[model samples]
Target: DPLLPGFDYLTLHTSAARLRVAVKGSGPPLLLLHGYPQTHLAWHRIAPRLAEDYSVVLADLRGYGESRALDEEGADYSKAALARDQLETMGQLGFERFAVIGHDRGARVGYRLALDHPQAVAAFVSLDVVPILDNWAAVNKVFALNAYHWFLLAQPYDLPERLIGADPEHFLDYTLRRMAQGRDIYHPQALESYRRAFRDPAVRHAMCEDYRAAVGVDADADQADRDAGRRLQCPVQVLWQERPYAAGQHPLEIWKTWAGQVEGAAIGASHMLPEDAPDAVLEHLLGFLASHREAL
Candidate 1:
């Protein structure tokens, strides 16, 4: 099926793209965004429980999972553009403002959404990522060695697309399997969905465009925000893995630069925190949302 039994599936049309979304539960609106090589299925374990308290909307980021993918100029894949898609989707769904939680690449979009449309976001949670500019600034041999895909995908043209396309299933499986670190934390069905979506060549090319924009236009936009001294007005909670990659840098201190109120802790997990540590993830998220609860 498309999602948990009770969730309603819909395609939300914005001016730029048609987004695939699943909505369930009822209360203040909450948007959940997933990282790369996965769909809203990233929230499969978490969303159902959260739906008990909030109207949860789970969605794929543009060019991933069931969402639309366009091979336009790089701007279309930039975080700012992706953020606009989320805002417009929420607007069409009668939500002027909502709480948001995002993982990995989606967290980049969450931060961008909070920064660009501050008035439209009630609260924000970012899972396992610093700002794109901060990431670039902090790059070292450790990051380069571990996250080689960041460099590989950012290469111009069909290089990445062709290579990944050559064996899409293998590439997808390899990357995700490595991230899971031999732990069978992922749902079998979710892994199947991820593999299925990645088979599309358009998805492969569009993903590369996402990375290209990250290094170029996305970084430029983030830099502009910093230069303008713009900061997030809403409360921001960040959850990061306690692994070497994230532990090397200070997540709470890094986020404090961009957000007025920041709180975070290192959870015991890998890149896929929601999957590996659902209980801990939920506790932190609920506490954060509760602290800033508002009738929206």
Candidate 2:
């Protein structure tokens, strides 16, 4: 309830999954998505502000939050599958085209949605991630250590599920600190919501499936797109918390490799840009989104 106040919450049934979404405001439709081990509440601090100018739809990705998912191999949780769920969520909401802003894994979905359904995405703002292919290609010992969860969560099936589910709260807390560069940034309410979602064994398994797909099928799709010279067709904005791991390669430079229209900057707030830097994130979001409504 503390998250997305005054918004209408509803269950949006897409062809493949049942999505939990909160909608508010009125204007050009806008979609907000959350990342790993978190529900749509990640946008709690940012969505309401943006809703002032655009219709904001905060949605839980399939297998996360209250959303439903078909348990299967990693393919079921691939970015492709996640992206389709998002597109259909918007379509079912009567929005054929809209802008998107996503954080962490949601940013992964945002880019994939733009890549897979270019016509549906009017513009995209990615918080804290670049394409997985680019990230994997640039992996180093530093990245491996900093982003160890990428490997930990991608472990086959019950392995991560068991470890994460063994003590989901601890893992969630640790992940929050790990991704935030060891800082305290999350609101207690938001933390509680994330904690609640992680306690579900089904959700834990689904999260692992998401990472598993990232390593295999999701990565494969990115490679195929690279092989086919495919690039994001919409105006793209990237925001990442500045980190030592990315010292050699800039986020914007990495994005330029996969997009024709791209612009971004590094925030000094570490990895959780939204929670760590809401005003700054919102300022950039509003300006960037306004320009892209009829801009590059």
Candidate 3:
């Protein structure tokens, strides 16, 4: 892919990991993080537009796409580890502070990054996720049935990897199709890209590790922050798919209970809000980026 004008592609080491990082466009730096079943490529539709003003940095998260694992055991897949890796990557690019956005799994990482390294993440966008702390504590019959993967992938370690690995393509296909409120959201090319990721043992392991950490260390970290009275330092703009978590209809309300200050509205699309609603996602993202460019 060509550099998007003023910005350029950069290969840099974040601690021990050397990442395939792409920097393009101009103005203040903006880091785009992709979620599960996708890579930096997931931002193809939105990146170009944002690149018009912000220096956009996109990377294949560890063990996904062109990025590699920092450890043989997939230790880098943990949100904290990957967040730290990308933090170093941003620092290497000379961004003492920058705006950050993430979708799905990427959103989870962004939240953890903001909480763990608030000094670096000036502002953040979290897409369609209940905070790790809120999710587990809030789960019930409704959430369980509506989102099966919440249980399937969150099950005991090796079971998820083993079952899904049996046929990653079919599994991913089912997930993409099922995750949508109805059917027909993701294109064939998008589904194929996700399938390809699952085909790789390393990527598959990382995906599972992402789900694992939701229950493992991530939840622990969130609880610790809660007990310590540490909330997100930056403004948080959340765009969540319409799904009620436990007693509340708005997960963003639950989010506000934690965020420093937040603004959120439901998107018409399903959980794959970015793919299903790219134009709307761009509107919301760039709007927030523009409005808050000087907030901090």
Candidate 4:
């Protein structure tokens, strides 16, 4: 699996844990975060283009891909905890502030980072996700029926871990294939990277813990922020799929409540926006980053 020509791969040890990252291009720093069951490779289709104008940093969230997954347990998977890992990572890389774009699970962490460290993130983009609290508030039979994995993976400990561990490779492939929905959008090499990570029982268990944290401690943290009237002041852009889990609601509307400056559009594609609609995603991202780069 080759990265964009000039990209360099290395591991950076944050105060929390070690992270696997790919860095390339040059200009204002921009970090890209991947979603569930995947890694930094998820951005392969668009990172190079973005790199042409910005210093692109692709990182595997803690517990995903080649990043370290600690043997300890609990809220380590919470978005807040995960966000800290990213914050420290950028600091170690000599970036006092940067722009961030996150897809799926990474989107969750992106928002958390913005809220927790607003001064550090000049701009933020969430590919296809609503805030967890908003998602829980709007859940219905339709959402449950279409997005059962949310509940399934959040189940108590060993259950999800054991089930996924049984046939980790097949489970990884099946999950990725299902999400892709028969679209040949993923690069074979990138898909193989995801498969390789999940093949490990530790990674499988860590993935389940991530879901567990989402439903447990993560939810509590989000609610607390709302109760305290915490909101993101940074420029926020959302690019959502036409028919995502929260298909019936307005993504921009939901996001507007959490951010002061919000702009978004519905892409006619799958949840994997970077892969399924790289052109559109890149356009929106480039414009947003350019508009905010000077601010950082």
Candidate 5:
């Protein structure tokens, strides 16, 4: 793919799924995970630059891109399961400890990785995301309308699949445009990759189940952590966008409840920060990484 010039693609088998990953560069391993309606291709704007100082490993979250997921009644689509996919895949890559930068849904999985496997992640950087439980708690008219997909996709099975499948490409295009607010944020090549995945029937099922898991299993996962007084031990950096879903309430503060050593700033970009404000995203991401890239 033009977007990923030097990266080599592979299908790596983890315990739960077969993940499609693109690996390149050297030095410290830095894993990048993409959110919904997109693939690892979302990192096309900045992955190459990150590859220079680290072995930049970008992978499609199961159920999205070419990666495949399997488990009991879609429970495997949970961020907890998704997090395990990443950890196992990274271990197979011989990266016992590495830093993580996850966007959107991937960001959900990112924090879970650090939480579930504390010693595996040296540093955690979340791009434009808050925890799944926090998101559900903050839902209101604006969230209900703009992020309606959360509700629609979480509906019981076949309906979401059928409705979205009817005009899948248009739905994907609309999702990308609406989320970006008409900005020219998506790379043409990356957009095509996203479109290709969105057209698949299986992928549509997987994406729908992902949201379902978010509401059920994933929310409970975070809630259990809260009850147990669990907090992220690794250094945490959250980069949220202007007018974010978690606006008005402090994103960093919301994160602080879930993690210790938390710090963040709002960048002048939309939800897709890496594509729209790659420079700022990279600067913050690389800077945070440099400070925490010790003895991993």
Candidate 6:
């Protein structure tokens, strides 16, 4: 009952195999998954507004906020684990199916969920990211600046942990400044909440593990998926930052490498689309959601 009145926050222990869940709102369900340097509250500004029209569910992904931590020392943080956690979280809340949108790290999870649980997701929106395998294979000197964390956190264990954990908030803030062309990408309150979430040791470890899993299980699973000729079966909408790259530098034609039935456009904001361009983001989300009013 914090942000939106009448909406109570309920926590459910989804167990070691999945994420512990937190839920809010009271209408057709919509799940907003957040990225690193963030918590479920990453969607706070956008969710409450969307909750006005649809039931919004904002739960921290494993190890991000108050949710579960990594199950083992070297547990898989791959798409399979992350996607399963989200599905289990929704299923426990009695949502057999729902619409989903994820940003950055969460976007990778959403992409997997749609592919693995196509029957459960009605539509998908990915903000500030393409697919992990696609993005990595495509990265170049110019594009590397947008996601420098890929290489930083991918370094040998204890390297990133020691460095980033030294001052999590400071590290995250630096990420924001690097991603954004300006400092006003997020409102003051939202920025503060993000800063606070990383103060927890479990949260910091989980964030690093997220990167670790990316380099390990995620990379393996992605290769296996490619070998098996797998591709996303659901409709996808992507919003990406395009100014820094030239024509065809980073295009959806590349996305067709793994997804089907996709449409997207680039915007002129920093990487924090939800914060930097909420109105533009909302316009696209509302229009996309409306198309599935009956189906989704």
lDDT tens per residue, model 2, 179-229:
777788788888888888888877888888888888999999999989999
What are the per-residue Cα lDDT tens digits for candidate 1 across 144-166? 98889999999999899989999
For all candidates in order, the CA lDDT equals 0.86, 0.84, 0.78, 0.85, 0.87, 0.75
Cα-based RMSD of the predictions, in order? 2.0, 1.9, 2.6, 1.8, 1.9, 2.5
Candidate 1, residue 61: Cα displacement in angstroms equals: 1.2
Which structure is stronger by lDDT: 4 or 6?
A: 4
Estimate, for each residue in 1-296, the C-alpha lDDT of model 6 and write its tens digit: 34434455766666554353446567778888888778776675577678778877777787776676446565556667778877877888888988889888888899888878888887788887766676667679855675678778778777878888898878888887876765566667767777877777667777777887787777677777789988877677887876655444465665566677777778778777777777888888888788767757
TM-score preference between candidates 1 and 6, better one: 1
Clashing pairs in 2: none
Order of candidate numbers by lDDT, starting with the best: 5, 1, 4, 2, 3, 6
Candidate 5, residue 270: Cα displacement in angstroms equals 0.6
lDDT of 5 by residue, 1-296 (tens): 36778899999987778889999999999999998889998898899889988999999998889998755355468888888888788889888889899999899899988888998988888998988888888888987998999999999989899999999999999999998989998878778889999999889999998899989988898899999999889889999887634454678888899887888889988888878898999898888888776734
Which is better, 2 or 5, measured by lDDT?
Answer: 5
Candidate 6 vs. true structure, TM-score:
0.89
**Largest lDDT belongs to which candidate?**
5
Q: What is the lDDT of residue 46 in candidate 2?
A: 91
lDDT winner, 2 or 3: 2
TM-score of each: 0.95, 0.94, 0.90, 0.95, 0.95, 0.89
Candidates 1 and 3 compared: the better one by lDDT is: 1
**Would you list the clashing residue pairs of candidate 4?**
none
What are the per-model numbers of colliding residue pairs?
0, 0, 0, 0, 0, 0
